Amino acid sequence: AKYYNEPCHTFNEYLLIPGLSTVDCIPSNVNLSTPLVKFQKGQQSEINLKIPLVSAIMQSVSGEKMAIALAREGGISFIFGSQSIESQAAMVHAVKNFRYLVGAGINTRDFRERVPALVEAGADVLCIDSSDGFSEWQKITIGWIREKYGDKVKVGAGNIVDGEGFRYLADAGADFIKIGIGGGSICITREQKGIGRGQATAVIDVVAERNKYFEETGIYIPVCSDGGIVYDYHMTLALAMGADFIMLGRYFARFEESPTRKVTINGSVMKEYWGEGSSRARNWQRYDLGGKQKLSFEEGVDSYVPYAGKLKDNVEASLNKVKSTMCNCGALTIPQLQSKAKITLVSSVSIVEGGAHDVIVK
Amino acid sequence: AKYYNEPCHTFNEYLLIPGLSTVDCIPSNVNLSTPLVKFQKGQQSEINLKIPLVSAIMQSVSGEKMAIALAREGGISFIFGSQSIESQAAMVHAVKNFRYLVGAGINTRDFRERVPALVEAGADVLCIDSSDGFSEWQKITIGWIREKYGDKVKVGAGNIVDGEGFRYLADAGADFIKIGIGGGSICITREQKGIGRGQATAVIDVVAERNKYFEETGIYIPVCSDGGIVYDYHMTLALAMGADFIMLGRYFARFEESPTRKVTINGSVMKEYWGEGSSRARNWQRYDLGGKQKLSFEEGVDSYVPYAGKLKDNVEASLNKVKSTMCNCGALTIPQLQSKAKITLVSSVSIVEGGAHDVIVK
Amino acid sequence: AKYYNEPCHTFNEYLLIPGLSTVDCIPSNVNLSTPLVKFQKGQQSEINLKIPLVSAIMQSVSGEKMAIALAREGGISFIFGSQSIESQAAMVHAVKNFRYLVGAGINTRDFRERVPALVEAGADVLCIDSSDGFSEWQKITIGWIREKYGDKVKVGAGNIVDGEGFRYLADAGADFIKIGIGGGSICITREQKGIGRGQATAVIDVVAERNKYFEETGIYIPVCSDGGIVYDYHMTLALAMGADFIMLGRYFARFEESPTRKVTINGSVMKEYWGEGSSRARNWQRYDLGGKQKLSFEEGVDSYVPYAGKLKDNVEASLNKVKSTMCNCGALTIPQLQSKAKITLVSSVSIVEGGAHDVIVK
Amino acid sequence: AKYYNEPCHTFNEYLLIPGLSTVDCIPSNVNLSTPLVKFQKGQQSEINLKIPLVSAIMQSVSGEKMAIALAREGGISFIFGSQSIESQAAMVHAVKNFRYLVGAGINTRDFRERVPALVEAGADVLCIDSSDGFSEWQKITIGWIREKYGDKVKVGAGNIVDGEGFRYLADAGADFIKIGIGGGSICITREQKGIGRGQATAVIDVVAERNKYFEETGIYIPVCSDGGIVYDYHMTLALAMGADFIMLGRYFARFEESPTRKVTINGSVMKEYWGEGSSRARNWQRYDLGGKQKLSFEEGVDSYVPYAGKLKDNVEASLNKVKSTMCNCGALTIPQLQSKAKITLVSSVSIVEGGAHDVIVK
Ligand SMILES: NC(=O)c1[nH+]cn([C@@H]2O[C@H](COP(=O)([O-])[O-])[C@@H](O)[C@H]2O)c1[O-]
Ligand SMILES: NC(=O)c1[nH+]cn([C@@H]2O[C@H](COP(=O)([O-])[O-])[C@@H](O)[C@H]2O)c1[O-]
Ligand SMILES: NC(=O)c1[nH+]cn([C@@H]2O[C@H](COP(=O)([O-])[O-])[C@@H](O)[C@H]2O)c1[O-]
Ligand SMILES: NC(=O)c1[nH+]cn([C@@H]2O[C@H](COP(=O)([O-])[O-])[C@@H](O)[C@H]2O)c1[O-]
Ligand SMILES: [K+]
Ligand SMILES: [K+]
Ligand SMILES: [K+]
Ligand SMILES: [K+]
Numbered sequence A, B, C, D: 001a002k003y004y005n006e007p008c009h010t011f012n013e014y015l016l017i018p019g020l021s022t023v024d025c026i027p028s029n030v031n032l033s034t035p036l037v038k039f040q041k042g043q044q045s046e047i048n049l050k051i052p053l054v055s056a057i058m059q060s061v062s063g064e065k066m067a068i069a070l071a072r073e074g075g076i077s078f079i080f081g082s083q084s085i086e087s088q089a090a091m092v093h094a095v096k097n098f099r100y101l102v103g104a105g106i107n108t109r110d111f112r113e114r115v116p117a118l119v120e121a122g123a124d125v126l127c128i129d130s131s132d133g134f135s136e137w138q139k140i141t142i143g144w145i146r147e148k149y150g151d152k153v154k155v156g157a158g159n160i161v162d163g164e165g166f167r168y169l170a171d172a173g174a175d176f177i178k179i180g181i182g183g184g185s186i187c188i189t190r191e192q193k194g195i196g197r198g199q200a201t202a203v204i205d206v207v208a209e210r211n212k213y214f215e216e217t218g219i220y221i222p223v224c225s226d227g228g229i230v231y232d233y234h235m236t237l238a239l240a241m242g243a244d245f246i247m248l249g250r251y252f253a254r255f256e257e258s259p260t261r262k263v264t265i266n267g268s269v270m271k272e273y274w275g276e277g278s279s280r281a282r283n284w285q286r287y288d289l290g291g292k293q294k295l296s297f298e299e300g301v302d303s304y305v306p307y308a309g310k311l312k313d314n315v316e317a318s319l320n321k322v323k324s325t326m327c328n329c330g331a332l333t334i335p336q337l338q339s340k341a342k343i344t345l346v347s348s349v350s351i352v353e354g355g356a357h358d359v360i361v362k
């Protein structure tokens, strides 16, 4: 077996150490644009978001209302694929003809039928939805798409957590690669199967490989930090570590625009939020290992998250914090932040010092 | 004194990082066979289990019903030796003539009488039951067996936690070596005597020495990770780290087939489970240091574990998780897993991220 | 991005290992004098405090009564600047003509008007109040002061946490540099923006750079450990690590002399204490990044701290502990302590051993 | 200031890894004898205990009854010195003429009068009682004793935690050196003054220096691990790390023979136990830094410990565990253990695995 020199870590263990802020480092001057799909050195991506936030490929998150609301704010939603091809295509079509950008998730089994339907519906980009994307199944799926559409259809892939996985999907032809296994708020894969890696360590490792790949091939492949975002500053950390954009489930599930019902639990207004690996969703394709067309066991839970209001207001508040921090770090663009960021791990005692302490908060 | 560069760790601190899964990496294609006794390079062990699980040499675990039920599923039980030679021989005989495989535990004191009786009863393999097997007492016991039976009788030995201990028992002639001191769920040896080592670190260290020994002698000695298995994924980790099979007490004590009584504690159906070092068992031979034929002090406790039902159903569920994970890692056999596994330590904060978080589980 | 070899740590994780105590190492012989502003090698600072304690630039801490009481004991207060120029100047004037030393906080926006008013009022030293002082805004402010007053006006600056930040402000001309981001008892910046560093690590790193700067230029720049002091021994640690003086908010807010109201909360007499970044204070200048003249979001909280009595009695008790420890370390002056101190990190288990344990405290 | 490469650790973080146990490694063959005072290479100490346990120099521990009971079992008590010279001398005299060995604590102030009185009373050995023994005060005290009695009077000294402190007291002429600052169960020095070091790290460091000193001078100076012993296995660890004997307070305070009252607290029979640094004891000499003859502030607490019965029965039970472990490690004497011991640090997760887990203890 192979071992590592250091244990993996995640977001709550890090802090950014401010660099020089020039007079032009004003939050209003910060440009949050970011590339969504791979491109050649010196050029621009064919698809650039205005903000680095994308909603998860989940039944309880990316519906028509979410896609429209997020697209309006500059991001993009990936309409969930854990539904019939016909219904998913209809959702994509409704968003495209509500021009707002919209993505759609696909699986490694019915892609020969689902892809044509989604392309026809007007999807701008696709993304294979898999817990563990380091597989020949994803290579086959991407290969078929390239075979039939060449570079006309953009397809994201994976969910790998190290350089090897990234390299495999990059060579396979993925337009962007998703990072993360087990970090999701409603995910229990790490406790059920024992696979995964701290989200931050995964991003840092994959980004290092992505940059080597870029120097070697001249091809820049955007990577997405998927799952584990709890606080707004976690967004800034993920971007600083090298992620081009961030995929979130819980963050968006709390909004009015999520397709779930609002429910009151103990005097608190909540919203339903469940994992694709829960018996409720039954998205067996996401965990498919060539076995029976059913969920062998649960890898996600059914839950409630606090209702946070409208997406627009929340996204605005979150990004204002991101932009402010970027200015503390002397960055006016995401690439600048990724270059200038000074990132340190924090001891548990330092964490205690970071919050309010030795006072009774009024 | 001698010190080490790193502290010891155990199962809960590790995770497997998935490798490439090929289209043939289907759970149904996974072969869980594993060698039980030492063999020569290029050859097969004289005894191979169909599944890598064996039940502990304990009064509250390995009785006749357990031995039959586990043998039926592909594993093997080691009938406890903390009972009269006559009664233990009778249990072995009943299992053999219920052909199901069955093992039997022996001690370093009455082996001249117990061994012949067990061989006569039809035991397929024996195993010295000792907390600390790094001793001349075990070497003497193994030597006597070899003297009287040559290689016809198979005897496991030890419970060592480092390369030195393994080497000693290997040279002594043990057919397989058991790893672990203090990791047992009902064991308090580490708190009473201050001896022991994290189970994972022990397995990793012993396996390293076992592989060097193999290259040096051409003799492959199977090793057993004994104790400390709490979750099903711990089984996968132990195997990935190099263990050929796993010995469990608590895991099996919870089943209908364990020889203990079912008792209701606070509306919950439980089963009795006690350590061999508890006053209830009085297995002083297991902790014998050439002193009086009595337990100097307790090193185990008397307890209750949740009733889990039938062994067959539980073992099936556990191994389905093991096989699934092996497929994520690209392995269809245990040796493949041990070769391909990528194993990382996990920070405490990463552990929190691994479970459900920031949601109210419904 | 840039990463570090070790995670940051803070006060609770350290202990001093006693050195040789000579017969002259008596608490009564300890000299707690310390320089407040930069000076040339071989010379003395133009301003030396008798004790290394200064009160925070906060509405809930440094008012007229506090400034007089602390000055009387040998320290100095920095009258808060989060108020009109006229009212702040009046406070400074009242203290100066109550001669007691007194400081005053300024911001990077209205300094052209505030500075003249404060100098006119008789302020002995000024200090830019900023969460993140690594900025051109501070350089511009210091430059203007030097332009108009040369070296006649002393101005402290910053709140940096590493060598780079220190170097920038030193070259900018600051008379003393303040260390610390996010360690304040009422501060939640690290949780809102994700920026900061463990206070101890920050002091140690900045001090190392300060000493290199001294050897290079012959100019000694005093540094201040600002925020995070919870226990009296934390003061000793900060000084031993290299800090010349310590800035405290919570510590002083608990005293009779703080400008806040005493309130009873659950039978306990408390005092109000709030952060400059709370909606109550609205000190937006402290977090200004060239944006709108308002607080974008809260970075501090409103709270209550236990009433501790008169400043004189408390400061006497605190410093008696500091002097005693200095004697255990064989130091009769702060520079001696900084030279002789032996400082070690402490494991969490060692921390448990440090307090009373395994006994019921009567 | 000076820093260290690793943080300090203490007893609960360590475990012994068993070595080879020969047939002669029987608990009954273990010799627990140990030297109390320094001697020349190749020779024997003038005072050897039969067991490596000594009672603390405390009012609530070492009275006449304790001294007699412990001496009977092979150890020695150091009659507390925080009382009049006359009364302490009377206690020593009573023990000597009850021949049982007995020690007596002295301080760095009234030694010119206390020492003669104690020698006259028949004390076999003396020991300076100080929290921080790295001082000229101890050197002066030892020097006076040597001046007046030469090598006829044996005097222990210190309480240092590193090689430097040991070296100083060794050169000063101490017959044995005590290790430890802040580890005491009733001690809060580390929380009041911020000085100290993990007990295990202190012992390990001092022992290393002691062994170098021995090679350099041919003089073997016994060292004592003082404070922090919570479990019986902690005794084994301290000895394995190099300590010749162990000083305990809490351990003995629980016995019938301790001079304190038995009190019932919540249906549990307890015994009073307080630190010498508590207002109850007022042992200001122990924390004397040449200041006023009074306790500047408390460094110890007043408490209750569980009543454990008679010393004889408890000491027998404790040492049976020590002897058993020594046999697991292949040692029949303390020097053998110190040579053969294999000591590892243990992760927090490994600690959890070490106790009973995942079972309901009946
Ligand atoms: N285990 C599951 O059932 C599951 N369902 C969805 N997800 C993952 O968790 C991410 C959302 O994480 P989060 O933003 O809620 O923390 C999704 O984008 C997807 O990668 C899951 O891990
Ligand atoms: N301390 C004891 O009394 C004791 N009794 C049995 N055992 C050990 O603990 C193992 C079972 O551990 P576990 O599967 O319950 O965690 C047994 O195989 C044996 O090695 C014990 O450590
Ligand atoms: N976040 C806030 O609102 C805030 N207000 C004041 N402070 C900082 O916290 C310090 C006082 O910290 P403390 O002594 O209360 O721990 C001040 O000197 C200042 O640097 C703050 O961080
Ligand atoms: N702080 C105190 O008041 C105090 N009083 C006694 N002691 C120390 O603590 C030791 C006893 O520790 P323990 O065996 O109770 O853990 C004594 O031998 C002495 O070195 C103290 O630290
Ligand atoms: K900055
Ligand atoms: K804070
Ligand atoms: K895989
Ligand atoms: K999770």
Ligand SMILES: [K+]
Pocket: C018, C019, C020, C021, C327, C328, C329, C330, D132, D133, D134, D135
């Ligand atoms: K000292």
Ligand SMILES: [K+]
Pocket: C353, C354, C355, C356, C357, D182, D183, D184, D185, D186, D187, D188, D189
């Ligand atoms: K303590």
Ligand SMILES: [K+]
Pocket: B132, B133, B134, B135, D018, D019, D020, D021, D327, D328, D329, D330
């Ligand atoms: K042994």
Ligand SMILES: [K+]
Pocket: B182, B183, B184, B185, B186, B187, B188, B189, D353, D354, D355, D356, D357
């Ligand atoms: K255990």
